[PDB]
Structures are given as structure tokens and as C-alpha cells.
Amino acid sequence: NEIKLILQQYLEKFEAHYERVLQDDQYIEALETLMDDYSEFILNPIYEQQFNAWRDVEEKAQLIKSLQYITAQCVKQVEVIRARRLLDEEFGQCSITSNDKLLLVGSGAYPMTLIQVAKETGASVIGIDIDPQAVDLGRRIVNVLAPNEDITITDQKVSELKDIKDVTHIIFSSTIPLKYSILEELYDLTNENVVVAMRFGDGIKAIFNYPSQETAEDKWQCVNKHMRPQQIFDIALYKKAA
Amino acid sequence: GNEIKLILQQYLEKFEAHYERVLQDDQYIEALETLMDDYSEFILNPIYEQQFNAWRDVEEKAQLIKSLQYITAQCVKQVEVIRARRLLDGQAEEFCSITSNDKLLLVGSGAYPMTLIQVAKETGASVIGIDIDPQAVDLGRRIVNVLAPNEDITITDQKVSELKDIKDVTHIIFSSTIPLKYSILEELYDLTNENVVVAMRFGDGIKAIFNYPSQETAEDKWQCVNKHMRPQQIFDIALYKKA
Amino acid sequence: GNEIKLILQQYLEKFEAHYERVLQDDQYIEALETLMDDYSEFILNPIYEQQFNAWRDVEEKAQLIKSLQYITAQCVKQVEVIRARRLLDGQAEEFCSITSNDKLLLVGSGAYPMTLIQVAKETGASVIGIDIDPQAVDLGRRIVNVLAPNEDITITDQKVSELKDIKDVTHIIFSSTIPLKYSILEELYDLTNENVVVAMRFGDGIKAIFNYPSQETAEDKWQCVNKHMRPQQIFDIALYKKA
Amino acid sequence: NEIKLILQQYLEKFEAHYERVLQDDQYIEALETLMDDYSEFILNPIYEQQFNAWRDVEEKAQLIKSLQYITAQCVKQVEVIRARRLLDEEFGQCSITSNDKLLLVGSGAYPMTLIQVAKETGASVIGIDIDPQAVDLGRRIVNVLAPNEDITITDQKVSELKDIKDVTHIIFSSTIPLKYSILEELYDLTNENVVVAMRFGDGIKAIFNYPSQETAEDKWQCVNKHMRPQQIFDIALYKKAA
Amino acid sequence: NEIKLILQQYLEKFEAHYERVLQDDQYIEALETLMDDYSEFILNPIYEQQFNAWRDVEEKAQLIKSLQYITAQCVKQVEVIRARRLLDEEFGQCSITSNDKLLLVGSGAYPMTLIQVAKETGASVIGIDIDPQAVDLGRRIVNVLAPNEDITITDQKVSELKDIKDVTHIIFSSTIPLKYSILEELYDLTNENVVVAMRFGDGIKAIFNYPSQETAEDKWQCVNKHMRPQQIFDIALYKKAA
Amino acid sequence: GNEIKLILQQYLEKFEAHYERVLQDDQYIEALETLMDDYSEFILNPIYEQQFNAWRDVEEKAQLIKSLQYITAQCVKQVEVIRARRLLDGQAEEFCSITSNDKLLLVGSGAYPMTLIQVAKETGASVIGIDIDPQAVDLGRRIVNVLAPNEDITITDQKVSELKDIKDVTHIIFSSTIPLKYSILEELYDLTNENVVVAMRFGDGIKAIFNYPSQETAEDKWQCVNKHMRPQQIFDIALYKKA
Amino acid sequence: NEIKLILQQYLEKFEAHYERVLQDDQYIEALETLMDDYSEFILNPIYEQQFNAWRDVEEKAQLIKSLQYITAQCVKQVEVIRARRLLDEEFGQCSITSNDKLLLVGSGAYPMTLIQVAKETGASVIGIDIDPQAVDLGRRIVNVLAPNEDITITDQKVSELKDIKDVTHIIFSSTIPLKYSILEELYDLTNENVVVAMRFGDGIKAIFNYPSQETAEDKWQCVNKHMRPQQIFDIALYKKAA
Amino acid sequence: GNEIKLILQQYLEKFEAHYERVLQDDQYIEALETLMDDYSEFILNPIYEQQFNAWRDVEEKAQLIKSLQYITAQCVKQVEVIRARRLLDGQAEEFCSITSNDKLLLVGSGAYPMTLIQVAKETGASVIGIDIDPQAVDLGRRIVNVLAPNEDITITDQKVSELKDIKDVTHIIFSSTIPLKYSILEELYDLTNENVVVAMRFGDGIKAIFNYPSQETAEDKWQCVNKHMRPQQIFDIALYKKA
Ligand SMILES: Nc1nc(Cl)nc2c1ncn2[C@@H]1O[C@H](CSCCN[C@@H](Cc2c[nH]cn2)C(=O)O)[C@@H](O)[C@H]1O
Ligand SMILES: Nc1nc(Cl)nc2c1ncn2[C@@H]1O[C@H](CSCCN[C@@H](Cc2c[nH]cn2)C(=O)O)[C@@H](O)[C@H]1O
Ligand SMILES: Nc1nc(Cl)nc2c1ncn2[C@@H]1O[C@H](CSCCN[C@@H](Cc2c[nH]cn2)C(=O)O)[C@@H](O)[C@H]1O
Ligand SMILES: [Ca+2]
Ligand SMILES: [Ca+2]
Ligand SMILES: [Ca+2]
Ligand SMILES: [Ca+2]
């Protein structure tokens, strides 16, 4: 009972903060505070166990779907504003080095992950994003924070990437709704030895993430699933079936 | 590939426009019904199915499927309402396995509940319809009073957990256009007697643009015991019993 | 004896008055329908049946039966018309033996042909309704268009000899309230294929006051192969095949 | 085809003559002439065979029922007017003598048959009729044409006849619609040795008569059926089953 | 007259064949032929109408009672021998499906009906019989012809059936003399919505069946009576009065 | 329940044994008569009646009733024969409505026809006794010659259809222990005059173990006009006249 | 890997049991047990999913073709031996009644399906089979189990059936290799309103059945496909294109 | 009709006999080769093709096609072996699109791999032959050493999944007489680079008696981009690229 009203309250605030933040930029501090609060809520064992206990399976879905939608849009808005203001253990043995090439799907307006991996690894990195504003801001952020690195950001779809066969590692942003549809597309486009990290969130985490899914055993094999109690998203590693 | 995509986009745009038009004027219903007839012919045409299956832009295809199944579910609801209003105004297969000692629940009964009425008259079974939309319940009840006043038909806006008699239900039918139908199936497990049979209406592949698809179930709970693929009908049927 | 006679006389007088009233004002229909409900309860009450069977004034009983079956046949026709008009205005078991490859003829389809519509929807068979009254054909056709426009239903005012397709008819149903139904059965012999089955609706004894009775047939032509006596329904059924 | 239009023409004339004869008595001569014409039509082998050949079984019935109705009423009207103006081989071995008692059902306003049998046989005769005018006229005719004979005419139903058990012979007028219903009633009312002559007409004769019927073999046994090509009605003899 | 001598001849043969079949099994073929002959006799419209015409009501009863007795015993003997050698439209809308439970009273040594309904419907079926030999043979036949089906055969009386309240449909063998006494007992034992099919035979059929009876309108209501000219037994359907 | 059942079983076994014994030796008659006295006291005891009515094993109760009414009917016949033989050897309420102008038929007159003799002497009526058993006729005739030689009593072994004078019979009495008495009543309808009155002896409930029960009649033929329930006598009486 | 060795083991046993059963009849019990085992294997979700997962598409084909061949021959042998020892919801609205006529292609030596439909429906039934021994045994079985029914068994090809145009329903045995070639032939031979039920098995079921095929949209339209998880064969319904 | 059937039966019987004879004596090879020449002329004769297409016994035709394509595939294999043995003993169009930078795989290389040798010498491409029959590999290798020792030709008995270099293959050719060639095509999809081109040899209609036919492919995988029907050659060619 309690969980439903918290989720409802969250959804209300999120939709308001979003509309207010799109109307005026100074609402960013409040939205960030809400997001920190939300993150703490999700990772708190009380609320996580209460969410799972709630067995109104139908009723939970509409809040989940609503929240995952509005939060994804809020995260994008935070990144855009942050950008304008400024202006591999997960992989284990399959980690990234200077001889590798990383594609990030959903690079974002403030592409910190992309810059971070490029600086530490030396690897060539490619980010794609469907939102042209995110591509524009992301590129400009790269020019300021990592101009010497080999980072390319584009609005190209995976099937338009001329160098897709040379990619060794792929990371998916969690807040991409059709991320498994893209993964399916990538099977034919990629070399045999590629490794994919799918960010996801299941259970209560699905209110701030898109969930995991079962994949066709004939294409992509899940080789690892990493559950991170202190992180807002978990990671699943996929390799092509041999 | 590109032709299927363009056709789907065109249908998507037309359905969205027709929805708005019919919401502000019920007299545009005949254009919606015609569009829906055209859509059905496209879906049931084996050439279009083959080419839809050939299209390789998985992401674009998923986005169009998701958008179309949503807008088409709402248009179907509106057609049912307008049809019910017109008959009342005067401007007008799942399972024999159901008998008169049985009790059928139909989830998503609709404003024009002809399926409900047909089961009652043909079988003599007790029939319950539920709908989440109260307008559909109200119109549905009035349709039942006009066409089948002496049959044992109850239409309510109760959730499955609220139903007093849920343990005595022998048969359940899900409307295809219910998004969360498999989540409801999961909840029904503990609510129902051991011998209940569920007919899940669905559409996969090209049929998923006018239907919600089938899903895997938990095999310790529900078992698919029968599947009817119907190449000339807009939805297929899967039967489930408890494991 | 005397009590049954008085009751029958009272019903006769009331039916004649109600007929006149409804002919000059369709808004008195609810009183006729109520009277008919009351009549049905009387007929299906086993105490009244026993006492009707006990009454020994054969001649008086025959006169009342003949008068009642006539006036009640006309009242039933009027009820069907008014019901059809009201649904259209917006002021609102025989044989499985019939399949979709079959073809049913119903003699006396009526202005509110629900039986016709039910056979079509449940079986998928081709269905023909005939009626001698053109108003019943017209209203019947319009009812069919409203409720079952996509089914293969034809309603006409043709006699059985005029029907182009009479040789392809697999099943025939007679309305109970047709006076000359057995004479029609006789004519159908040469018009129909060897395997046709006929369901004759009838009522004998007390039921003959709201129905035309069964009759002996020529045994070289038609043979009774089945008879269903239904103590809680207003008419019984006899099945005939060719000898 | 031809027969249907003759029957239609007959029905039309009959209904007119009836209405005209009820409005004014001087139309009697015309109605009598029509009835003589009708009788000749029925007994003529052409029309009799044409009637039987007509296989519109449904269509024939409505004309029959109509004609038999209107003609029965015309015969009564002729008898009434005739009365006012004035004012046993069939049985064979079971014939009527002076020691017998005859009941005629449907004695009529001009009860010639009743007077005729009474004068020839010496038998006591009783006539009944449902029409009080026919009883009144019939009695008065008897007083004029056979006052010395033992003839009683009454409006009593068979079940009200105190002397019904002493009746030896019963004759039914053909134009009584429910004559077989009366016959069924008579089984319990009559002695064991009674004989009944049922006047009837089948085929074309049914347009001027009510037809014969099958009887319950357990009560009344048909012992003879007399077909008379030159008579408007035929005769069936019934005795109680032994 | 003729009917009485046929019935007498039948009774004589039946009593002989029975005694001979109990003495030696090889007489079964002759008894079967007699039973086929008898069945054809009963369903033949000549003999059926002659039987009804015979109005020696007292005399008919002793032959009926005798025949119905001897024939019932012959049918049992046929079933026993058949067994050893080997070793729902009636209901209409109230038909049997896989979720129903059927009790047959008088299951017999060769329980074909029980196996037949179980295989077609999927319903759980229970047969009872008073004759322990019939229970023993019936069970063994089931094990051979339908081992996977849910069929239980027992010598329990209806009042000893622990699952009687879950029964949805009941069928009575016609050749049970006190079948209506059992029906009366079942009213208290059964659920509200049960449907009963009483096999019976009236008229000539009563020489191979026990007859129908009027029931207490307060308990069991006859809802249908099915007369089957080409079948040795008819069916009456009963439901509890509402 | 169980006690009544055991008592009935014990009486059944004892009656069967006593029948056999008396058939092979008429000197065991006194034991049969004593058993029958005991049986009568059991039947007429209102405590046993109440508990018999309480017993709920309808089938078992019906079987015992049927077996007892049969064996007791034969024992009663044998007692009558032995009583008649002993008087001859020298080793020894229904209707005033009967008058000397009347004529009584008693169906089942018996070997010791005291009822017959009593009606004749008290009323002066003409009396006919019939019995299906010729030994009963013979002994009955000889008893009548000894005790009432000057009365108008005829005993024959004719069926009711064979009686010359059946139309002149004013009164009829049926013995209770005749199995097919109501079927005979049905046949008598057409054989008898309009004013005949029939006294049917019967026993229902507990009394049905020593009697054949009453039955419904066809109401168009025979009408019950009077019923005498006699708590201290072994049979009750119902009077019938023609409807 | 595991599936291939099971299939190999099955094939070995099947070929042995077949050769042994053709040499001596007493091996029938073992072959039946093997067939029950095989049926359970095919319908078990583990083995069905393992079969589909095996992506040695070439290698699977030789085992399939081999198994479907040997099993078809074993089924025939079982039916022959069974025969010698002894000696419509699928259609839905298009079901079989007494006025219909059914042709079964591949009637078999023990034609239970043919007898079953004939007894329940009243329909006239025709079975054909290419194997003369199956025709001979099938006819003889019919004479014993259903002599009164209208069942004709012949070795005629579809094109030699004089009454083929009056057939309303056709059922194909699954184990007929060229069943779709026969279906193509039937288009010209049959009336317009005929309905065909093609028994088939796809996936793992193809090891005990011949598979489904795509048909010429211009002739036969698939109107229904019935997948039956608990049955060794599935059903496809075909009607002529309008 | 009957003539085509008889001819086919005669060829079937002759091929089966010749196979046996050549297996037990390689000196009967000239009779087999002559029969095969005759068969080719029959297949390529447009009159025989028309009449084969006219024959309406679909089932009989299918059985003969299936039997002939099997026995003829084995005879062709034997001819290749005997030809290879005789040359060694001393008793003796698909695609320019192939260049020296390319790499061709031929599935079903055969014991006398002249096609392989011709591609290598004319194009300068690297060539791989595979065969499932090890005798064909051995003889094929020895033929290549005799006639083309300096070309880059490798013949192996590896399946397509075993080939180290399968990703570098630019061109693939299937022998027509491989039964499961389209199933192999399906497996090659994931094994090969994006730009591979496949030449599928086939024969349909009359040509299917000496060849395996073409098939529909999954349109999301392989697309027919070109088809060459050759009325004077024993097999046709279809080219496939990835969708
Ligand atoms: N969670 C939920 N619970 C309940 Cl009780 N009802 C729900 C629900 N989600 C939605 N509904 C209700 O479903 C109604 C559907 S009416 C259209 C029927 N159309 C056929 C054929 C068809 C298939 N494709 C298109 N039409 C069908 O959907 O099977 C509609 O009135 C809507 O208010
Ligand atoms: N000769 C003839 N030929 C044809 Cl083609 N039609 C004829 C006809 N004679 C009359 N009719 C037509 O029959 C119609 C009957 S509508 C009432 C149905 N009611 C049920 C239940 C019922 C039983 N009792 C009361 N209602 C029934 O009658 O079975 C009526 O519209 C009338 O115009
Ligand atoms: N169908 C039939 N027709 C005729 Cl003419 N007679 C028939 C008959 N069936 C049987 N009988 C004869 O009836 C005689 C009965 S002597 C016992 C009288 N006892 C009293 C009091 C009584 C009641 N309960 C026990 N005793 C009574 O039964 O009323 C017996 O001799 C038997 O041969
Ligand atoms: Ca049920
Ligand atoms: Ca049919
Ligand atoms: Ca007196
Ligand atoms: Ca190149």
C-alpha cells in the first residue's frame, strides 16, 4: 500500500519538475535533488522488498512504465543542462585496452562514460545517440574535456556505422526502451568475438531503467549477470553463441 | 523493407488522425471502420506477412509495432462504443467445452459484448464480463438488456481479485487488445480452482500490429495445452491449464 | 372442468381485446407481453395440464382450443413486429447436426428472426428464412442487417415451390404457429433431396392452445425419427426424415 | 389453375349472397340457384378430378376452409327462410323401425330428415341444434307437418339429454365442424349397441361439407363407408368396438 | 390375440436360453440372436400398435413383469460372457466435458458406456453395480480397454459414495427395477445443479426395460423426455426443482 | 432405521419359511396365524409407523415392501384355504348404501368368503364373488352352501369382462391383496353403468407391507369421492365414482 | 550433442525391432513399448527444445529422414499384427454429421479412426490404402467391429474413386510421404466446399511424421493450424481458395 | 501421360541395374555413360518437357522424380570415380566476377574436379573443394596434382563449419546433385562475410529427375539476385547474396 503512494508521489513530482525544467533552467537543482532521493529510495532494502511484496501485478506495471518513461526524459534533460552549463572490471578478462574499439549506444549530451573509458584505456570510442541535441552537445563537451582522444559522436544508427565490424566492445545505456531490438540487429553487423554490456534494472530498479530480457540462445548468450546492490543499474554481459 | 515501413507509418498517421476526429465527432466512424477493414486485409495477406517477416530493421519495426498496437487498441474501443450507442439510439471459437453448468469470465468485455451474448445463448452457461472502462460496462449492460435480458450475464468494472465467485469460474477468455493480459493470467493462478481453462487471444508477427503478442509463462504455473493459428482471422488463440 | 373452461374463456376474451388495442396503439404491447407470460405459466403448470386433460366436454374444449390457437398466433406475430420496430427505432435446440457446409430453411421466420440469426452465428451454415407476411420479411431483413450483416442469411416471401435452391437444403424448421405446416411438409417431399431432416415444432394437449398440434404423416413419405417433449418450454419438437 | 378461380368466384358470390340474404329475404331464389349450381359443380367428374390434381396443397386449404364455412351458414339461412315461408338403407341391416330411437345432431330450422324418418319408421326421434332460432322454427314446422309423430326438438347438448342411453341410432349433419368431438363425447353417454351415421365429404365435397376423420380404434370402429357419386355428402357408419 | 402368443413364445425361449446359458456358455450366440430379434420386434410399428391395442390390461401386466424380469437377467448374462471372452447429445446444453464427473448406476460386467463417455469427454467417471461379479469383470475390462482414463467401479451404494456431492451428471441403466427409489435417495446426497438421465421404456418397450414414473414435483423436475423410435430405450432428464 | 430393517428382514424370512411348511403340512397353520397377528400389531403400532416413515434407505425399504407384500398375499390365501377346509372337515364397513335392490361384485372373494356372506345377510343384496384361483371358488361355494344357502350369492372364476350382468352391478369391492387391482379398475370403466361405486381396499406407508398401495387414477374416468384411514385396521378404504 | 545420440539409439532399435518383428510376431510388445517411449520423448519439452537448438541442420536431416521412414513402417507393422490378433472438434464449425461423406487417405490395417468417425457421426466413410494387406485386414476388422456402418475400404487411388465429387471431408494420415502431392491432385477431383485435414508434424515431431508444407495459394488455402503439445501429430485445415 | 510414365520407369529400372553392374565391374562404365547421354537428350528435349508438364498424376510423378534424382546422383558419382581412375591408370558459367584476389569454395567437388581446375586456371583465384565422400577427395587431389600442380587448389573432406578460412570466401558454388544444399546454404549465412555470392546449381520440372530442385529461402537471410535458365544444359543456376 505504502509503496504505491510513494511511487505515485514520485511520478507526480517527476512530471512537474520535467515541465518546469523545460520552461526554466533554474529548476535543475530541484530535479537533481529529486533524482538523488529517488536513487536512494530504489537502493534501500526496505522499499526494494516492499516493491517485490506488492502483488497487484497489473497495477504495478502502469506506474513502472510511467516512471521509467518520465525518468528517462528527466535524465536526458539533466545531461543537456549540465552540458550547456559546462560550455572495465565489469568486463573482467574481457576488458578494454588501447587496441580495442568501443561503441556506446546512447552516448548522451554529457558523455562522461565515453570520455572516461577513452582516457583510461586509450581505446578508440564511438558514441551514437538518436537525439541530435545530445550529439551536438556531446561532441562539444568532448572537444573541451578530451580533444586529444579518439572519440567520435554521431547520430548514425548501428546499421549506418561503416566501422561496425571492427568494434570489440559495446555498451548499452539502460534507459533505451528498445535496446534488445538493437542487440538483435547487431548480431549480423558485428564480428564474431564482440562483447556486449547491457545496462538494465529489474524489480524496483525498473522504475529508473528498462528491464533485462531473455535472448535467443542461438544468437546472443548471456555469459555473466552482475547484480550491484549499491548501484542504480546492473550489468549483463553477452557474447555470440559458438 | 522500405515499402512495409512506409505502409506502417501511413497506417499509424491515419489511425492517430481518425481517433481524434471520431473523439470530436462520432459521425466519422464509417471512415475508421473502413480503415480498419483495410488494415485487417493487409495483416491477413500472406505476401505482406512474408515481407514484414523479411524486414530487417528490428528497432524500427519494434517501434512501429508498439505504436500501432496502442493506437489500434484505442480505436477498437471507440468503434465498440459508437456501435453500442448507434444500436441503442436506433441509428444502426475459443474452446464443445462450455456447458450450462459452467461459468465463463471474459476479461475485456467491451461496449458491444457480442461474444458474451453468444456464449450465453449457445451454451446456457453463466457469464461474467469485466471491463476496466466504466463507459464500456454501462453500454455493455444496456446492450445485454436489449438483446439477451433473460440470460445469466453480469457485466461489472471489478478487478479479478474483487470477484466474489472467482473460485467457481470454469473458463476464462482474455481480449487480445489488453496490454497486461499475461500479468493478469499470473495473478489468476491463486484466485482460481485447479481445473480452470484460459483462452488467451493474441497476435504475433504481423498480427502484433493489431494485437498484443503471446508470452512465455512460468511452467510451474500455466501450461499451453493448445494453440490455434488462424490465417484468415485477426487473432490467434492459445489455451492454458494449470500445471 | 368448469374452472379450466372459465380460465380459457377469460384468456380468449383478453387476447381478442389486447389484439385490437395493440393494432390501434403499439404502446399497449407491454400488457400483451405480460398476458402472454401469464398464459405460458398456465400452460407449463402440470396441475393445469392434468385438469385440462381431466375436462370431459370434448366439444367445448375443441372450440376453445381452436379459437385460442388462432388469436394467439396473431398476437405472437404482432409482438414480433412491435419488438422489431422498437429495436430499429431505438426505443428498446431443434437438431450438433448443423454445420457450416449445411443449408437451413426456416418456414415462418418472423419479424424478429432471432432463431435464424442464432443458427447462422453458431453453425456458420447458410440460412434461408421464408414468411408469408411481407411486413415480417421487411422487418426481419432489417433486423438481420443490424445484428448479423456478414452472415449468409436470406429472408424472402417465396413459397417453398418457388425456392431456386430447395434441393440443396439439408435442414428445415417449421414454426409451431403455422396452421398448415403438415400440408407444407407433404409438398416438400418431392421438392427436397433424399437426406433432408425436418424439425416440426408443435404442441398437443394443453400446449395446443398456444400452438398447432402434431399430426399423423403418410408413412411411405415421412417418418418420425425423434421426439422431444419439453415440460418447461412452450413447444415440443418432432424430427422427420424421408422413409 | 382453372379450379382455383372457380372456387374463388364461388366464394365471392357466396359471401355476397349471404350478406344480401341477411339484409333482404328476396335474395333467397338467387342463393338457391347458386347452391344448385355449386352442387352440380362438385358432383361433376371433370371438376372433381381437377380439384384432386391441384397440388398446391397449402393454397387449396384456405379456399376449402373458407368455402365450407360460408356454405354452412348459407344452408342454415336457406332453411330458416324456407321454414318462415311455409309458416335407412344407408344403415342396411342396422335400419330404423318403430321400436328404435333416433337422435339427429344438427336438426335445422327446416327439419325434413327428422320428419321423414319419423313418418316412415314410426321411431321416436329427437333433434338437437345449437341455434335457438333453428330449434324454434324446427318445432313449429313439426307441429304443422307431423303433429301426431313422436318428435322432440331441443337446444340441449348431448350431455344434457336425459334419454341419451335409450338412443339406438344417431345421425350427424355434415356441416357441423366439431362433429367428431361430439362423437367422442357420445361414447360414454350411449348404450353398447348404438349405431352412428356420420355425414361427411372428402376431396371436392369438402367445399360443401366438413371432412371425415380417423377415430380412436379403442372407442368407435368404422364399420362401413358409403361413397355416393350422385350425392353432395357421403356416409360413414360407426359402432362401438367390441 | 397375436401379440399375446408372441410375448408368450418370447418368454418361453428367454427362460430356456437363460437356463441353458447358465449351464453352458456356448448358448450365448443363440441368446444374442434372440435379443436382436426381440429388439427388432419392439421397435417395429406393427407390434407396437398391436401391443397398445391389446386392452386386456390385467393380462398384459403378467407378461410384461415376467419378460422385463427375464430379459434383465439375460442382458447381465450376455455382458458377463462378453467380458470373459474379451479377457451427451441426450443432455444437449447440459452435456459432459473434461471438468465434469459422471456416476452410472448399473455399470455392468461389460461397461462400454462408461469407457465410451470417459474417452470422449475426459470426465472422471464412477460406475456402481450391486452384482460383485459385474464389478470384478467391469474393473478388469477397464484395465484392458481404458487403463489411462479416470474410471472407478465399485459395489458401493449411492449413500456410501464419499464423492457423491461432486457428481455433475448421473445416468441410470433402464433395467434397474427400483431406479426411481434410488433417484429419490439421491436428492439429499447430490449438489443443487446435478442432472440425471433416466433410461426407461414405456408401452411395448416396457417388455425390455423398466418403465418411467411420475416424480415428486417438489424434488426432481422432469425437464426433457426423449422418445427414440429406433432405440430400445428412451431418456428422461431430471433436474432439482428451483 | 437399522432396527426397522432388521425386523422387516426377520418377518420376510419367517413368512417364507412358514409358507413352505404350511404347503407341506396344513397343521402348521396356527404358527402362521400367530405370526400374522404379530405382524398386524407391528403395522398398527404408531411408534413402528413413525420409525418406518423415518427410515431413509428408500431403495432397501422399497425392496422389502415389495417382497413382503408378495409373500404375505400368498400366506393370507393359504390361511383362507386352511380355515375353509377345517370348518368343512369339522376340525374348526366399505360403504347404509347397499340395499336389497342392489348388486355387489367382490373381486378376490377368497376361500373363506365371510365378507360376501355378511353383505348378503345384512343387506339382502344380490352378491357375486369372483376369484382367479379355482380352489378358492370351490371352497368358497361350499362355505356359502353351509352358512348361507338361501341367500343370492354366486361365486365364479370369471374375469370381469366375462360377467353377463356386469352392467347391473351397483357396487364393487376390491380385496387389498390384489396386485393389479387399479388396472382392473381401469377396465371396469367401460363395463359398468354410470352410477357404480367402487370400494378400493389399500394400504400405504407401513400398511403397504401387508397390502397393495393406492394409486393415482385417470381423473377423466374415476374420481376419489371418499377416503377412510383406519389406524386400528390392517387396510384403509377409498371410494371411487365415475367422473 | 545429447539429442543426436538419442536419435541414433532410437534409429538403431527401430531398425532392429522392425527386422525382428518381421521375423517373429512375439516382438510386438517390445516394439509397442519402444513406440510409447518414443512418443513420450517427442512430446517432452526438454527434448523438443534440444532438437530445435541443434544447429547442425545438415546432420539432423539424415536422422529425421531415416527415422520418419523406419517409424512409418513400424506403425504399419503394429497395425497389421494388432488386426490379426483381433481376428470432429478439429474441424470446429466444419465438423462431420450423418449427411456428410469422409475419405481417409491411409486407412491402415487397423482402421480405428474410420470406424470411430462412422459410429459417432453416421457419415458414410471411405478409406483408401496403397498396401493390399492393409485393405484386406482393414475390411475384415470393419466386418467385425462395425458391420452395420457404411464403411468402404479399397486400394483405389483418389483418381479412381467414382464418388470423389460427393466427398465433403478428407483426412490424411501423417505418415504418407507424398501427401501434399495427393492434395494437389484432389483439387480438380473434389467439389468446391470440401475441407481437408492434413495430419503433420514439424520440428521434433517430424521424426515420427511427415512435415507440413506451403501450398499454392491459388488452389488450397490453409484456414487453420492446430498445434497440440500433448499429441504426436498436429493438424492443418485446408479449403479451396474462393 | 502414360508414355512419359513408362519412359521414366524404364530409365529408373535401367539406372538401378547399371549402378549394380558398374559397382561389381568398372568396365560397364561405357553403357552407363551412354544411358546418361540418352537421359540428358530426353530431359533437354522440349517436346518431352511439355508432355512431362502435361502429366497430371502428381503423386506418381513425385515418386518417380524422387527415385530418379537419387539413383542418378549415385550414378554420376560413380562415373566421376571411374573417369578419375582411368585417367590416373592410363586407360583413358556460374558467375567476369571471380578474380585472382578472390577465394572460391565448391561444395561437392567430385572425384573428377574439372570445374575446380578450370576456375583456378582461368581466374587465378584461390580454390577450395569439399566433398563428403573421402574417395572423391583422394581421387580429386590426385587429379589436381596431375593436371594443375602449381595452382592454389585445396580439396578436403571438411564440413563448411570446420573450414578455418570460411570468412574469407568470396564465392561459393553448390553442385546440383547435393540433396541438402539449401540446408547448407542456411548454415553458411553466419559462417560467411557480408559480401559473399552463392551460385546454386539446380533443376526444376523435367530437369528435377537429374538434379535437386530450387527452393524458397528465408528472405531476411538470402536473396535471389539472378537466375539463368539454360534450355540446352542439364542444370540451371541461381545466384544468392545476403539480404
Ligand atoms: N486490464 C484490463 N482489464 C479489463 Cl477488465 N479490461 C481491460 C483491460 N485493458 C483493457 N480492457 C478493456 O478491454 C476491452 C477490449 S474491447 C475490443 C475487443 N476486440 C477483440 C478483437 C480484436 C483483436 N484485435 C482487434 N480486435 C479483442 O481484443 O480480443 C476494452 O473495452 C478495454 O476497456
Ligand atoms: N404458411 C405459412 N408460410 C410461411 Cl412462409 N410463413 C407462415 C405461414 N403461416 C404463418 N407464417 C408466418 O409464421 C410466422 C410465425 S412468427 C412466431 C414464431 N413463434 C414460435 C414460438 C411459439 C410457439 N408458440 C408461440 N410462439 C413458433 O411459432 O414456432 C409469422 O410471421 C407468420 O407470418
Ligand atoms: N386379479 C385377480 N382377480 C381375482 Cl378375480 N381374484 C384375485 C386376483 N388376484 C388375486 N385374487 C384373489 O384375491 C383373493 C384374496 S383373499 C385375502 C383377502 N384379504 C383381505 C384383507 C387383507 C388385507 N391385507 C391382508 N388381508 C383383502 O385382501 O382385502 C385370493 O383368493 C386371490 O386368489
Ligand atoms: Ca462443467
Ligand atoms: Ca453436411
Ligand atoms: Ca339401489
Ligand atoms: Ca575481389
PDB file of C-alpha atoms and ligand atoms in Angstrom, chain H residues 97 99 101-102 170-171, ligand 7:
ATOM      1  CA  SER H  97      33.167 -11.844 -61.300  1.00  0.00           C
ATOM      2  CA  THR H  99      39.492 -12.686 -59.968  1.00  0.00           C
ATOM      3  CA  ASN H 101      42.261 -11.843 -55.298  1.00  0.00           C
ATOM      4  CA  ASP H 102      39.122 -13.967 -54.712  1.00  0.00           C
ATOM      5  CA  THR H 170      34.169 -14.577 -51.713  1.00  0.00           C
ATOM      6  CA  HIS H 171      32.346 -17.105 -53.885  1.00  0.00           C
TER       7      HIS H 171
HETATM    8 CA    CA I   7      37.796  -9.397 -55.099  1.00  0.00          CA
END
